[PDB]
Structure 1
Amino acid sequence: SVSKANVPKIDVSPLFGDDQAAKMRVAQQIDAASRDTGFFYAVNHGINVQRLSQKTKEFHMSITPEEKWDLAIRAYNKEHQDQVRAGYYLSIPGKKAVESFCYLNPNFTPDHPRIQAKTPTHEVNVWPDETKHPGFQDFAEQYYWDVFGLSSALLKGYALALGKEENFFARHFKPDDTLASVVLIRYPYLDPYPEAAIKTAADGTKLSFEWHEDVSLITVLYQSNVQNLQVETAAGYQDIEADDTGYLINCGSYMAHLTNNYYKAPIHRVKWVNAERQSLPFFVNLGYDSVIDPFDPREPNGKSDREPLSYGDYLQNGLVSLINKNGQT
């Protein structure tokens, strides 16, 4: 009754090199996937995902309630009015299964100009005690830059796919000001599983997270090997097969805006599965003042007439809207 989505595996290794024709062949595959279901797996990416999964598991399984309160975002701890994005998102025993830890650009320090100006969406990361979680902060900050590098290469592929010079997106994706985030999500095995944490879709499917478009330019996702994602097509939802060696890639709504919906942001949802698993997205966000003039690849002259949208305004509105529509995570 439920079909399986065509999600190609694309070797992205040429995007790190200087063979221009091989890069074009990767771009063609990105274009094709982006115009079909909107998802592809990036393989030969060079990231040590075994260590990513191990270190994340050690953190999730060793952190205590005391530490979670100390790291909690404002939604769970009224004392932390400056932590809207960065920190711990608590589970609620008997009611809410998912829990997660979100961190932002490690360069956002108290001395950073955007932090000194109190610009919305910029926060300084909070971390657990080094002595209770030795090496965790070092690993997590290094991971940020590893996935930043992969994402920068992917953005070159997207640029070439759309007929632009390879730095068209990447020039706005900078270590000093990127609003990109990593979220380390734990979906636990629970017996009994709290019914309040299961949502029923219109078609009767039991869900952990309802349909949505991503608030991102692109989303770069690593998940353990438990099938859970579905993508909407005109003929209904289709299952995305899991692969715990690759990164699952899709566009967010900022890409849809700037391409006049040529690359749509695919609508997707998370099925309920009672299994211990990890979901580790990196949301590729630009800088607060980054603006890309919209264009329409379908038109010879590329004219669009959609309004340019500052990334900061897009992100602030998008994060709130997603909470209002799909709930506080």
Structure 2
Amino acid sequence: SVSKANVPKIDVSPLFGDDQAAKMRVAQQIDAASRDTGFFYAVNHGINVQRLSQKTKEFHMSITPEEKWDLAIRAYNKEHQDQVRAGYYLSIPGKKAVESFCYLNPNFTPDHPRIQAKTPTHEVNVWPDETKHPGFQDFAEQYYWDVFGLSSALLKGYALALGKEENFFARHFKPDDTLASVVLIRYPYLDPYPEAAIKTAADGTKLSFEWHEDVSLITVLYQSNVQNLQVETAAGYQDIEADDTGYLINCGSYMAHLTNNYYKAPIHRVKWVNAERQSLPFFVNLGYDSVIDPFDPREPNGKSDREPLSYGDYLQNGLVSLINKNGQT
């Protein structure tokens, strides 16, 4: 009895090239989708998602409990006080089903200026032992750059969609400094499935993760072919169909801020499904000091009554608030 959300499939391949007219026609599609449900699938994106899913499966299914403590973020291992964002997010059998591995910009090395300054939200990635997970770090770091490239193209399309020059957002999205993250989330099959790991929405829907807006500029998401996401619209929560060949794209609340809610951050949630599956977001974050002056494409002079917000301020505030609201994940 739940209706299907409108989530168009947009061929984003022009965004990689030099046909300006064609890019405008993609931008229009992005504009339409962003004004409607706030979701679309990017197709013709060039990324080998089957291989991503296979490498990720090999990792999730071979990592051991020992390795998970050794990689754990601070919320699970108090010895790892520098790991707020990057590392392993453990399950809790009987209580919490989901588990995940998060990594940041591979350029955040020990000698990076923001790591030396101990700037919040910047960390040096932690990795399992190479001999236990051969090839994994190298694959994961290359994936970061492949999805970075897609995301830069997408950001060209959002900039054109909003009446700007194509580098309006991408000029703030740079390999040396982006705060973007990849999260490799495992949602398990469990028999029996612990009730304590199932939340219940006001409308009675069983959930794995409650309603929220994303903490991002845009989110660039690969998921297995198991339907699970729902978007709130004017006609209520609607099901977002799965497509394990595309990337699911939506705006996060930084985009809503910069656009004066012209491109809303859609409110969405994750249904509980008893199936072994993957959820692999790339959160498109800018640099710590990046500031985009807010504007309003519905107003003749483009002016907004919002104040400029630096991305770093936005991000550290947002991640903490999301944990408080919906739980440590």
Aligned ranges 1:24-173 → 2 under 5 Å? 24-173=24-173
The DSSP-based 3-state class of the residue aligned with 1:203 is coil
Show the counterpart of 2:300. Answer: 300
Deviation for aligned residue 1:305: 2.3
Residue 71 (structure 1) shift: 0.1
Q: How does 1:187-198 map to 2 (within 5 A)?
A: 187-198=187-198
Compute the displacement of 1:300 (Å): 1.3
Structure 2 alignment gaps of length 5 or more: none
SS in 1 for 2:50: helix
> By how many angstroms is 1:2 displaced?
0.7
Post-superposition offset of 1:13: 0.2
Aligned-residue offset at 1:290? 0.2
Deviation, 1:134, is: 0.2
Q: Deviations over 1:126-152 (max 9, x none)?
A: 000000000000000000000000000
Alignment of 1:212-291 (within 5 A): 212-291=212-291
- What CA distance in whole angstroms lies between the structure 1 residues aligned with 2:306 and 2:148? 29
d(CA) in 2 for partners of 1:268, 1:323: 16
Aligned residues: CA RMSD: 0.3
Secondary structure of the residue aligned to 1:220 is strand
- The TM-score, its normalising length taken from structure 2, stands at 1.00
**Aligned sequence identity (%):** 100
Task: State the secondary structure of the residue aligned to 1:219.
Answer: strand
1:34-92 Cα shifts (integer Å, max 9, x gaps): 00000000000000001100000000000000000000000000000000000000000
Q: Deviations over 1:150-195 (max 9, x none)?
A: 0000000000000000000000000000000000000000000010
Q: What whole-Å deviation, never above 9, does each CA across 1:98-118 have from its counterpart, x for those lacking one?
A: 000000000000000000000
Deviation track 1:8-55 (CA, whole Å, cap 9, x = no partner) reads 000000000000000000000000000000000000000000110000
Q: Using the alignment, how far apart are the partners of 2:48 and 2:234 within structure 1?
A: 36
Q: Aligned with 2:282: secondary structure?
A: strand
Shift of 1:94: 0.8
Residue correspondences, number: 329
Alpha-carbon separation, structure 2, partners of 1:51 and 1:139: 10
Q: Which runs of 4+ in 1 moved over 4 A?
A: none
* CA displacement, residues 240-295 of structure 1 (integer Å, 9 cap, x when unaligned): 00000000000000000000000000000000000000000000000000000000
- Paired with 2:303 and 2:313, the residues of 1 have a C-alpha distance of 23
TM-score (norm. length: structure 1):
1.00
1:234: Cα distance to partner? 1.6
Gaps of 5+ in 1: none
1:235 to partner: Cα distance: 1.6
Q: Secondary structure at the match of 1:250?
A: strand
Give distance in 2, aligned partners of 1:316 and 1:303. Answer: 27
